[PDB]
Amino acid sequence: HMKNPYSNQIEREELILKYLPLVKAIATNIKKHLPEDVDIRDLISYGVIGLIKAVDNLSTENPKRAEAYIKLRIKGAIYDYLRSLDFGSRQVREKERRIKEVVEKLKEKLGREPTDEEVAKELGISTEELFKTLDKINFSYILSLEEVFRDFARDYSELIPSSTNVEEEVIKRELTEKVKEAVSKLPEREKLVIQLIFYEELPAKEVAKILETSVSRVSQLKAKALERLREMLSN
Amino acid sequence: VNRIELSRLIGLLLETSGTNKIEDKVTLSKIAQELSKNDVEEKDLEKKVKELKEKIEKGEYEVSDEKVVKGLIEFFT
């Protein structure tokens, strides 16, 4: 049954409007892993562009499926923008090396784990500068891991629309089991940090308080865990 | 505003002349400002931390591969 132009226009706007809270939720969740300096309005901005494009290229009539697709495009547009930034730059990777060295040097020299104030001191920077750097470093590993997950999504987002619910469940199970295999090969300490960060949805700063350690420590554990997962899932 | 304004802002966006990229950057920013106007993010953050830490010290916190999987998948997909 044909549809009038005013109707198409309105259905579209209502659909966009309907999912704006979703863009907020996604931007906020991603913000927990980004340096404080990244403006959530930028994330939301790109996230809305992603939302509008998803709505236009929509034809699936299984609401839950439309939503899962919308969610996927929003995350995609936000990571598309974040990846165009300097996260994977050489300067960031260099700072990561310098920091690991400094941390290890202080560990032996003190017999214990250094504090963030002590790490920033041996580096000659403020703790705010350090927290930013650790966030950029950690986000680089998030980006790299996202590339892997996107490879999977790029494939299954082409099948699910013409697949049955039972088949979708199978495709989804193959993904969960593939991730479960990699997760099982993480050290207890790393796995615990990953759970508190992603399953409990807690920023590194909060995880530091729970584990009674420094932010620098929680960060190396997160980066190591994220690095492992990428290699594991890539092979 | 938290409905009437959004609908109006979306209207400006979907109407693009007026020089797109430039105008849209502002419109998009305004849409973002409306969505995060009444932001007081931390609801039970402080309590969740305490409850979690107290449970980890009490040896009452389960770390499973299922939860970590649910975490990563929900975050990335």
Cα torsion through A166, A171, A173, A175, rounded to 10:
-160
Same domain for A27 and A129, yes or no, is: no
Contact between chains at B41 and A41 (C-beta distance less than 8 A): no
Solved with: X-ray
- At residue A221, what is the residue type? L
In whole angstroms, give the CA distance from residue A219 to residue A131: 10
CATH superfamily of B41-77: Anti-sigma-28 factor FlgM (6.10.140.30)
Residue A40, domain CATH:
1.10.1740.10
**Domain extent at residue A209:** 86-235
Mind telling me how many Å the CA of B18 is from chain A's nearest CA? 18
Closest CA to B48 of A210, A218, A30, A36: A210
The structure tokens listed for A172 are: 């989804």
Domains contained in chain A, number: 2
3-state secondary structure of A39: coil
Query: Based on the domain organization, do A98 and A15 belong to the same domain?
Result: no
- Inter-residue contact A183 to B68 (CB < 8 Å): yes
Handedness of CA A95, A99, A102, A108 (dihedral sign): negative
Chain A interface disruption, residue of B23, B62, B69, B70, most A CBs within 10 A: B69
- For residue A28, the chain B residue with the least C-alpha distance is B41
Structure token pair of residue A215: 């932010």
